[PDB]
Amino acid sequence: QLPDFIQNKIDHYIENYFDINKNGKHLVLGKQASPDDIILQSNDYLALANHPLIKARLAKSLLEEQQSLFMSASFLQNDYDKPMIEKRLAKFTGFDECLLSQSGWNANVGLLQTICQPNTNVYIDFFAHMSLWEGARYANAQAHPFMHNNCDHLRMLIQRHGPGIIVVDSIYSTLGTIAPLAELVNISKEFGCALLVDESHSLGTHGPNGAGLLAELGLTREVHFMTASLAKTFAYRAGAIWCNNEVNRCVPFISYPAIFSSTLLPYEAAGLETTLEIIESADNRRQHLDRMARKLRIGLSQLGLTIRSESQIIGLETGDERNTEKVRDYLESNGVFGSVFCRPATSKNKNIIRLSLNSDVNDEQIAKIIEVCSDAVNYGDFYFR
Amino acid sequence: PQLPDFIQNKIDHYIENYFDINKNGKHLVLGKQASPDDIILQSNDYLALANHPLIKARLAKSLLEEQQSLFMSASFLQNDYDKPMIEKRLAKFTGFDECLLSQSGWNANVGLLQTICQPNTNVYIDFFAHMSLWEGARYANAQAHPFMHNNCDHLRMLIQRHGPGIIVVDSIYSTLGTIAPLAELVNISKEFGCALLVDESHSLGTHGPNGAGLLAELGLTREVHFMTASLAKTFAYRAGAIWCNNEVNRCVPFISYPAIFSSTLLPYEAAGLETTLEIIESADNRRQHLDRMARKLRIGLSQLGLTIRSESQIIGLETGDERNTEKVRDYLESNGVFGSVFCRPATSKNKNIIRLSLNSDVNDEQIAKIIEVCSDAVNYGDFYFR
Ligand SMILES: Cc1ncc(COP(=O)(O)O)c(C=O)c1O
Ligand SMILES: Cc1ncc(COP(=O)(O)O)c(C=O)c1O
């Protein structure tokens, strides 16, 4: 057992976050899924996790003679030490330079540490990813949250607070909405602002050969920074920073997680190249996903639910905790497993049960989700928003 | 597309005062390129397991099995049937109650501190404690109170002044190789009703019975509240772990931001760690060898009149200012010895370290050569040593 100043916090937490739930667990933890159940919890959009060629390429490079490169990524910043995958990924998205990181989180935290000073203006969408808020808070930037995809509010804020960095998800993790990138590019140009787009949820699923949403819209050359977790479509535990400028020569010596935390091992980079080749040609998978996503969005919204989504991420709005619990349990009972997003990913009264669709989902399964929600809507134990 | 000036400012000033001010036009950590026959002492893989055929075998095998698509937060994986076996076994290995996996050692410490701190929680931290510990506390808005390196008297005053808090240390320090007074710190922990957090990143696997670490060696396991480690040192893997002698690991996966918003380790990674743990548990031979070689180097170098604070496989050469450090590095590299430059923000500007990290594949001959090269450096070298 523990001294009071920690224990008090730990008792309170357990009481207000575990004990209050019908199952005694934290709200995200439901029951165990069957193999027959529809699992919509994974960020692996193109269902690549178990792809034979990717597995083969990693195992192969894993079995080669690994040189003992257990140290920071900064010690490996010479051209000969810099992996082929960065050059290819840069080429892929159309950005100048690409830098590998240990995760999407670290890419965001790192980039924001490099370009920010205390009280730097950071104009960040209300619903942008936590990695981005925390990036900015670590750097002691001045956060100026703006209302979701609301360009008028952003205009007011910049005009009020001066030039800064405008930070957005291209596709938002909780809601599946799409940022207004064309208008956001105009705005940054107009006010002398830097623009940072986190493409974690569009990279691979969107754009030509899956090069992303900036690449789809034709905006690549008009943006300063893009970051992305490689743990979504790229199905790998890593991240990347892209620059249309020379910031990537500096990140490795300034970012604390790049300086003080160990780099990706050489065999990990070769795993990604194969993945890239597979993503690059997965037009069918990209298109199937897009079809199913829409079919699900249409069917759910017509039942009266707010489906803000315009993508493969679909957020059922379930309100308060007690309600969310009731919705989770009902869905799971009927073989539908989404992921509870509660605090601090959300406000405590605007919970989301997120459905991450992937290219392996079929029409029959889409039909089932709709029907389950349609039955929900008349069972009488809960509400949607 | 043009960067606004308040960015370009910082970048231009950085490239200038950090790349351009250096002889070879690159950052101070980048020397000349090493070759085959040089002696490399930069790796953290102290038991030289990186290339171990059995680890590579088990890892490849595990990856080839059918993967269920687990690309999500570890939050969603905290049901007992989702929790990996490596935790139970890592716990049992160190003697700690519960163990929790993390994506890095850095995250390990951030996660834990965010869980146990409230704003204005006293954190008595060693000056030389790892950056991850400082930042861990700073992200949790804790009151951080720095005590002088390995100084119990200083620590005592601070606690008397500000009250009960968390005492935070490395067991073996990352830039100096020094060893904390763990026994004494446990006393103070008791003398003032505090909690103790030890990072064993550089002792775990190299020290204790079967490499269970320094706390296990000194039999302090049951009286320490928290331990953490990077698995990227001796364990030769990109991951982290948090051990607790209490219920804290029940909450970390749901409170810690790195644990909520960053993807988990994939199941096959966990498997590869089990095999590492087995190998380490039996690697008495390599631990004994590495202990002896380190001792030779420490003794060897001190005789030259050098400050060697070290008591472990990590030896820190103290090179003072940046200009000088560049000289010592260029000299040591010229004669076949490759350490790691440790400059700011890892050190204060005028107190740089070149860090020689030993491993179990270093032999007598190489030690003799490292000692010999440092002798020449002490004598004919156009530079000093703090
Ligand atoms: C004492 C200590 N703790 C934690 C870490 C961070 O480890 P990781 O690279 O796994 O994040 C290190 C540095 O690498 C370390 O020296
Ligand atoms: C928009 C967004 N950015 C960043 C991340 C963090 O990525 P990672 O898991 O690789 O740290 C995620 C969440 O996983 C995300 O959804």
JSON list of N, CA, C and O and ligand atoms in Angstrom, two decimals, chain A residues 43 103-106 108 129 131 169 171 173 198 200-201 229-232 238 354, chain B residues 261-263, ligand 2:
[
{"chain": "A", "resi": 43, "resn": "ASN", "atom": "N", "xyz": [-7.72, 0.55, -36.07]},
{"chain": "A", "resi": 43, "resn": "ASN", "atom": "CA", "xyz": [-7.38, 1.61, -37.02]},
{"chain": "A", "resi": 43, "resn": "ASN", "atom": "C", "xyz": [-6.79, 1.07, -38.34]},
{"chain": "A", "resi": 43, "resn": "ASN", "atom": "O", "xyz": [-6.50, 1.83, -39.26]},
{"chain": "A", "resi": 103, "resn": "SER", "atom": "N", "xyz": [6.21, 6.94, -33.21]},
{"chain": "A", "resi": 103, "resn": "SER", "atom": "CA", "xyz": [4.74, 6.93, -33.19]},
{"chain": "A", "resi": 103, "resn": "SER", "atom": "C", "xyz": [4.16, 8.26, -33.66]},
{"chain": "A", "resi": 103, "resn": "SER", "atom": "O", "xyz": [4.85, 9.27, -33.66]},
{"chain": "A", "resi": 104, "resn": "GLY", "atom": "N", "xyz": [2.89, 8.25, -34.04]},
{"chain": "A", "resi": 104, "resn": "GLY", "atom": "CA", "xyz": [2.19, 9.46, -34.47]},
{"chain": "A", "resi": 104, "resn": "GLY", "atom": "C", "xyz": [2.29, 10.50, -33.38]},
{"chain": "A", "resi": 104, "resn": "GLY", "atom": "O", "xyz": [2.67, 11.65, -33.62]},
{"chain": "A", "resi": 105, "resn": "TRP", "atom": "N", "xyz": [1.97, 10.06, -32.17]},
{"chain": "A", "resi": 105, "resn": "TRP", "atom": "CA", "xyz": [2.12, 10.88, -30.97]},
{"chain": "A", "resi": 105, "resn": "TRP", "atom": "C", "xyz": [3.49, 11.58, -30.93]},
{"chain": "A", "resi": 105, "resn": "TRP", "atom": "O", "xyz": [3.55, 12.81, -30.94]},
{"chain": "A", "resi": 106, "resn": "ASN", "atom": "N", "xyz": [4.57, 10.81, -30.92]},
{"chain": "A", "resi": 106, "resn": "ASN", "atom": "CA", "xyz": [5.92, 11.40, -30.94]},
{"chain": "A", "resi": 106, "resn": "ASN", "atom": "C", "xyz": [6.22, 12.35, -32.12]},
{"chain": "A", "resi": 106, "resn": "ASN", "atom": "O", "xyz": [6.90, 13.35, -31.93]},
{"chain": "A", "resi": 108, "resn": "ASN", "atom": "N", "xyz": [3.99, 14.29, -33.69]},
{"chain": "A", "resi": 108, "resn": "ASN", "atom": "CA", "xyz": [3.30, 15.52, -33.29]},
{"chain": "A", "resi": 108, "resn": "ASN", "atom": "C", "xyz": [3.97, 16.28, -32.17]},
{"chain": "A", "resi": 108, "resn": "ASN", "atom": "O", "xyz": [4.21, 17.47, -32.29]},
{"chain": "A", "resi": 129, "resn": "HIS", "atom": "N", "xyz": [-6.51, 16.06, -32.36]},
{"chain": "A", "resi": 129, "resn": "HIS", "atom": "CA", "xyz": [-6.03, 14.93, -31.55]},
{"chain": "A", "resi": 129, "resn": "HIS", "atom": "C", "xyz": [-5.25, 15.36, -30.32]},
{"chain": "A", "resi": 129, "resn": "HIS", "atom": "O", "xyz": [-4.49, 16.33, -30.37]},
{"chain": "A", "resi": 131, "resn": "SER", "atom": "N", "xyz": [-2.59, 14.23, -29.05]},
{"chain": "A", "resi": 131, "resn": "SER", "atom": "CA", "xyz": [-1.15, 14.35, -29.29]},
{"chain": "A", "resi": 131, "resn": "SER", "atom": "C", "xyz": [-0.79, 15.78, -29.67]},
{"chain": "A", "resi": 131, "resn": "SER", "atom": "O", "xyz": [0.28, 16.26, -29.33]},
{"chain": "A", "resi": 169, "resn": "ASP", "atom": "N", "xyz": [-6.54, 18.02, -37.60]},
{"chain": "A", "resi": 169, "resn": "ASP", "atom": "CA", "xyz": [-6.62, 16.68, -38.23]},
{"chain": "A", "resi": 169, "resn": "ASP", "atom": "C", "xyz": [-7.24, 16.90, -39.62]},
{"chain": "A", "resi": 169, "resn": "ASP", "atom": "O", "xyz": [-8.20, 17.65, -39.75]},
{"chain": "A", "resi": 171, "resn": "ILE", "atom": "N", "xyz": [-8.67, 14.29, -41.19]},
{"chain": "A", "resi": 171, "resn": "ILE", "atom": "CA", "xyz": [-9.89, 13.56, -40.80]},
{"chain": "A", "resi": 171, "resn": "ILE", "atom": "C", "xyz": [-9.84, 13.32, -39.30]},
{"chain": "A", "resi": 171, "resn": "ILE", "atom": "O", "xyz": [-8.85, 12.78, -38.78]},
{"chain": "A", "resi": 173, "resn": "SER", "atom": "N", "xyz": [-10.37, 12.02, -35.57]},
{"chain": "A", "resi": 173, "resn": "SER", "atom": "CA", "xyz": [-10.37, 10.69, -34.97]},
{"chain": "A", "resi": 173, "resn": "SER", "atom": "C", "xyz": [-11.65, 10.30, -34.24]},
{"chain": "A", "resi": 173, "resn": "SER", "atom": "O", "xyz": [-12.03, 9.14, -34.24]},
{"chain": "A", "resi": 198, "resn": "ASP", "atom": "N", "xyz": [-2.50, 16.85, -39.51]},
{"chain": "A", "resi": 198, "resn": "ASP", "atom": "CA", "xyz": [-2.32, 15.46, -39.12]},
{"chain": "A", "resi": 198, "resn": "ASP", "atom": "C", "xyz": [-3.16, 14.56, -40.02]},
{"chain": "A", "resi": 198, "resn": "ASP", "atom": "O", "xyz": [-4.38, 14.49, -39.84]},
{"chain": "A", "resi": 200, "resn": "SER", "atom": "N", "xyz": [-3.25, 11.22, -40.16]},
{"chain": "A", "resi": 200, "resn": "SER", "atom": "CA", "xyz": [-3.40, 9.83, -39.65]},
{"chain": "A", "resi": 200, "resn": "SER", "atom": "C", "xyz": [-4.60, 9.05, -40.20]},
{"chain": "A", "resi": 200, "resn": "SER", "atom": "O", "xyz": [-4.54, 7.83, -40.34]},
{"chain": "A", "resi": 201, "resn": "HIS", "atom": "N", "xyz": [-5.70, 9.74, -40.49]},
{"chain": "A", "resi": 201, "resn": "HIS", "atom": "CA", "xyz": [-6.91, 9.04, -40.87]},
{"chain": "A", "resi": 201, "resn": "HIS", "atom": "C", "xyz": [-7.29, 9.14, -42.35]},
{"chain": "A", "resi": 201, "resn": "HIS", "atom": "O", "xyz": [-8.31, 8.58, -42.76]},
{"chain": "A", "resi": 229, "resn": "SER", "atom": "N", "xyz": [0.43, 9.17, -37.82]},
{"chain": "A", "resi": 229, "resn": "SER", "atom": "CA", "xyz": [0.73, 7.88, -37.22]},
{"chain": "A", "resi": 229, "resn": "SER", "atom": "C", "xyz": [0.78, 6.88, -38.35]},
{"chain": "A", "resi": 229, "resn": "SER", "atom": "O", "xyz": [-0.05, 6.94, -39.25]},
{"chain": "A", "resi": 230, "resn": "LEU", "atom": "N", "xyz": [1.77, 5.99, -38.31]},
{"chain": "A", "resi": 230, "resn": "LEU", "atom": "CA", "xyz": [1.80, 4.85, -39.23]},
{"chain": "A", "resi": 230, "resn": "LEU", "atom": "C", "xyz": [1.05, 3.65, -38.64]},
{"chain": "A", "resi": 230, "resn": "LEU", "atom": "O", "xyz": [1.06, 2.55, -39.19]},
{"chain": "A", "resi": 231, "resn": "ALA", "atom": "N", "xyz": [0.37, 3.87, -37.52]},
{"chain": "A", "resi": 231, "resn": "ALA", "atom": "CA", "xyz": [-0.38, 2.79, -36.87]},
{"chain": "A", "resi": 231, "resn": "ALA", "atom": "C", "xyz": [-1.86, 2.73, -37.26]},
{"chain": "A", "resi": 231, "resn": "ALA", "atom": "O", "xyz": [-2.66, 2.11, -36.56]},
{"chain": "A", "resi": 232, "resn": "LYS", "atom": "N", "xyz": [-2.22, 3.38, -38.36]},
{"chain": "A", "resi": 232, "resn": "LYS", "atom": "CA", "xyz": [-3.58, 3.30, -38.81]},
{"chain": "A", "resi": 232, "resn": "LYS", "atom": "C", "xyz": [-3.53, 2.43, -40.03]},
{"chain": "A", "resi": 232, "resn": "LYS", "atom": "O", "xyz": [-3.38, 1.22, -39.91]},
{"chain": "A", "resi": 238, "resn": "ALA", "atom": "N", "xyz": [4.66, 3.15, -35.55]},
{"chain": "A", "resi": 238, "resn": "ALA", "atom": "CA", "xyz": [5.60, 4.25, -35.81]},
{"chain": "A", "resi": 238, "resn": "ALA", "atom": "C", "xyz": [4.87, 5.53, -36.25]},
{"chain": "A", "resi": 238, "resn": "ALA", "atom": "O", "xyz": [3.63, 5.61, -36.22]},
{"chain": "A", "resi": 354, "resn": "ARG", "atom": "N", "xyz": [-17.18, 4.89, -31.16]},
{"chain": "A", "resi": 354, "resn": "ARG", "atom": "CA", "xyz": [-16.60, 5.04, -32.49]},
{"chain": "A", "resi": 354, "resn": "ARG", "atom": "C", "xyz": [-16.60, 3.73, -33.25]},
{"chain": "A", "resi": 354, "resn": "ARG", "atom": "O", "xyz": [-16.27, 2.68, -32.68]},
{"chain": "B", "resi": 261, "resn": "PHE", "atom": "N", "xyz": [-3.59, 7.50, -26.12]},
{"chain": "B", "resi": 261, "resn": "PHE", "atom": "CA", "xyz": [-3.68, 8.08, -27.46]},
{"chain": "B", "resi": 261, "resn": "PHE", "atom": "C", "xyz": [-2.64, 7.60, -28.46]},
{"chain": "B", "resi": 261, "resn": "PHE", "atom": "O", "xyz": [-2.65, 8.02, -29.64]},
{"chain": "B", "resi": 262, "resn": "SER", "atom": "N", "xyz": [-1.76, 6.71, -27.99]},
{"chain": "B", "resi": 262, "resn": "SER", "atom": "CA", "xyz": [-0.75, 6.06, -28.82]},
{"chain": "B", "resi": 262, "resn": "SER", "atom": "C", "xyz": [-0.97, 4.55, -28.85]},
{"chain": "B", "resi": 262, "resn": "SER", "atom": "O", "xyz": [-1.27, 3.93, -27.82]},
{"chain": "B", "resi": 263, "resn": "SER", "atom": "N", "xyz": [-0.83, 3.96, -30.04]},
{"chain": "B", "resi": 263, "resn": "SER", "atom": "CA", "xyz": [-1.02, 2.52, -30.24]},
{"chain": "B", "resi": 263, "resn": "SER", "atom": "C", "xyz": [-0.22, 1.63, -29.28]},
{"chain": "B", "resi": 263, "resn": "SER", "atom": "O", "xyz": [0.89, 1.98, -28.86]},
{"chain": "C", "resi": 2, "resn": "LIG", "atom": "C1", "xyz": [-5.33, 11.80, -35.47]},
{"chain": "C", "resi": 2, "resn": "LIG", "atom": "C2", "xyz": [-4.34, 10.97, -34.70]},
{"chain": "C", "resi": 2, "resn": "LIG", "atom": "N1", "xyz": [-3.08, 11.50, -34.52]},
{"chain": "C", "resi": 2, "resn": "LIG", "atom": "C3", "xyz": [-2.11, 10.82, -33.83]},
{"chain": "C", "resi": 2, "resn": "LIG", "atom": "C4", "xyz": [-2.39, 9.57, -33.30]},
{"chain": "C", "resi": 2, "resn": "LIG", "atom": "C5", "xyz": [-1.31, 8.95, -32.43]},
{"chain": "C", "resi": 2, "resn": "LIG", "atom": "O1", "xyz": [-0.67, 7.96, -33.20]},
{"chain": "C", "resi": 2, "resn": "LIG", "atom": "P1", "xyz": [0.20, 6.82, -32.51]},
{"chain": "C", "resi": 2, "resn": "LIG", "atom": "O2", "xyz": [-0.69, 5.72, -31.98]},
{"chain": "C", "resi": 2, "resn": "LIG", "atom": "O3", "xyz": [1.10, 6.22, -33.55]},
{"chain": "C", "resi": 2, "resn": "LIG", "atom": "O4", "xyz": [1.04, 7.44, -31.43]},
{"chain": "C", "resi": 2, "resn": "LIG", "atom": "C6", "xyz": [-3.66, 8.97, -33.46]},
{"chain": "C", "resi": 2, "resn": "LIG", "atom": "C7", "xyz": [-4.16, 7.91, -32.48]},
{"chain": "C", "resi": 2, "resn": "LIG", "atom": "O5", "xyz": [-3.71, 6.75, -32.41]},
{"chain": "C", "resi": 2, "resn": "LIG", "atom": "C8", "xyz": [-4.63, 9.69, -34.18]},
{"chain": "C", "resi": 2, "resn": "LIG", "atom": "O6", "xyz": [-5.87, 9.12, -34.35]}
]
